[model samples]
Target chain A: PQITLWKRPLVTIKVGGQLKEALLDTGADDTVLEDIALPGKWKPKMIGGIGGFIKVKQYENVSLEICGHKAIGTVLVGPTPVNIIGRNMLTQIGCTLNF
Target chain B: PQITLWKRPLVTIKVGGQLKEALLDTGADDTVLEDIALPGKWKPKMIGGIGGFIKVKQYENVSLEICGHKAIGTVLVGPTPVNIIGRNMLTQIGCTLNF
Candidate 1:
């Protein structure tokens, strides 16, 4: 099957009470949002991570599920200001992009 | 430890028995080699994956190592043509960048 790159409306789990937009990426396997782009105090399940395992939980659980099938997986937090959808999530709900 | 974004010449475990180059992505949490950029038949391990997990195995191990500390982690496979050094390795040997 021929595959192409597609950018669909994606959702991100806000962190540190900051609100921002995130890209839905099936190419990734986990769920991730920027720490500097969120608003409101969030309580998440912090877990082990590359930088170091911390108790990380999704600040919001499916606050907004986009159309055309969304994804789910362990949230992989990063220090950057952008969210990511990695393998952990993509694998659970097979995501696809057609452009 | 305070973290910063740093780009260095990393290594990749080539697939398909073909030798290619890869980056050591500390931000990533798994070992991933691309499928389209490799040449030859390779069989390291076949595990379930997103976009449908098929048996996946690393074509090469430790072909190249970079300077200034390294990392180790589970190989999260991908369909792209870029090899990635993920959390599986980063967490093992705390990767850092000083620039």
Candidate 2:
């Protein structure tokens, strides 16, 4: 008998070697934190976007390891649950999603 | 003879009584800054969304005057050109867009 094991396709982010589960979403313009219960660093910078500019301070960027892949970009910090996965992280990986 | 004059709807953000023009866009979830031109005070907090948590720094909050109506909220700061406008500012005013 051939048994198959299925797992949810997940993108993990490792900060200081600690892996955190990251939800993947294309609806968001950039990455975000929605849950307010995670333990990590918080530091922020000015993020420029299409409409206008806003100052969001929180979290830190150490190294963003996505789906076992890595990309270099500033990550916004927050204690919120996972909300949005931005194009910046996925654009580089260049993978396809199926429903 | 009667003449009609048309003017673009501009939102002025006042910092210490100085004002700046703000671009309006509903497509963006939040506002952003680019070009790195302008001056203001900035203190940030953590904001997270879908993919993971990220820390966005820069900017501050003050009174924003739009269409002669004013509202107060925390404004993000950066020395850059105006970009997208979020729902936070628009929902309160309840104005319709024609474009």
Candidate 3:
């Protein structure tokens, strides 16, 4: 699946038994999602990058299906504007940057 | 050029007469770079997203050479951990997402 950046690289993804739109971000190191009530035992943590530090809930071994590609990785739940599928899961789902 | 996400999609770019590494970020709305002594009259602005708001310098119509492609757009000079070539410039260079 090749997507142009003519607009934001927005795509539908499935996680926690629900479907939602997320960004396929190549710039981020860890996948960060908006707050969700997914069934899991998350540990409290903090992320310092992407401008500043913020407290977040870290969930490990989260299942993600993006553009039909499934991946398992650690996902951070935070107050992000958009759900971001960063390199942590981007690599697992074989997402790449083309120019 | 198709970049793999096994590692950060970092590339050498020319801006302000210096070559530096930057990430081709699909998730970001505006291009952001580390503080540099680029000659320009920047307007003071604040970024309210990406966890929190912070004061930044916004420069317009700045020249950028990313991955050998050239573009001109508004770039934000802030205290970022890395240089980001966001959608504003990614579209100019025809960067896309391929999975």
Candidate 4:
């Protein structure tokens, strides 16, 4: 499947039995999700990117579906201004940049 | 041309007759370059991203060559932590995300 680049490449995703939208951020180092309820314990971590750094709860073995593609990995939940799908999970779906 | 997704999609770009590397950030709304000498007049502006907002000098009609594709658009120069090629310029080269 292919996705056209918009000003913001936003896509619907299902995580923790809930549906939400996230931006496909090639620039972000890790996936950051707005704080939500998930049945798992998480470790504290810090992520730094374009703006600054933020503390997040890193939940491992989290399952998520991005645009119908299934992916299982670490998901950071925090006070993220926006939901971001970073390269970590993007690689699972074999996403690439095409011109 | 197709570019495989990396942990960080970094590319070499030519701007202001100088070559530099920048991250292809889909999350960024505008292109940001580290302070450099580009012959042009600019207006003062502010840009906010994942972290916080920063003051910048917005220069229009900046010619840049990215990954062998030519583009002309507005460029912001300031004390940015990293150089980023945002959607504003990426759209000019017909870039998209594919899986």
| Inter-residue clash pairs, candidate 4 | A51-B51, A52-B51
Q: Could you give candidate 3's per-residue lDDT for residues B69-90 as a string of tens digits?
A: 9999988888877888889999
What would the per-residue lDDT of candidate 1 be over residues A1-99, giving only the tens digit for each residue? Answer: 222212223453343344456554433434565554433455555433222333444544433232233443345444433465544443334433221
Candidate 2 residue-wise lDDT, B1-99, digit = tens: 010112212355443355556544333334443333435656564443222333444454545565455655545443324433344554444432220
Individual DockQ of the candidates?
0.04, 0.02, 0.73, 0.70
User: Can you tell me which runs of candidate 2 are displaced by over 4 Å?
Assistant: A1-9, A33-55, A58-62, A96-99, B1-99
Candidate lDDT (C-alpha), each: 0.42, 0.43, 0.85, 0.85
TM-score of chain A of each: 0.40, 0.54, 0.91, 0.93
- Per-residue alpha-carbon lDDT of candidate 3 for residues A10-79, written as tens digits (9 for 90 to 100): 8889999889899888887888888577776889987766557777789999999988999998999988
- Residues B23-66 of candidate 1 have per-residue lDDT tens digits of 54433334666653443445566433222234455544433232
> What digit string (tens of lDDT, one per residue) describes model 4 on residues B1-99?
777666589889999989999988877778999957978689999987666677889999999999889999999998787888889988887878877
Tens digits of lDDT, candidate 2, A12-73: 66644566776543323455544334356565655543233445544545356666667655
The residue ranges of model 1 lying beyond 4 angstroms of the native Cα positions read A1-99, B1-21, B35-54, B59-64, B67-79, B96-99
For model 4 the local lDDT of residue B58 reads: 95
Model 4 bad stretches (over 4 Å)? none
Least accurate 10 contiguous residues by lDDT in model 1 chain B: B1-10
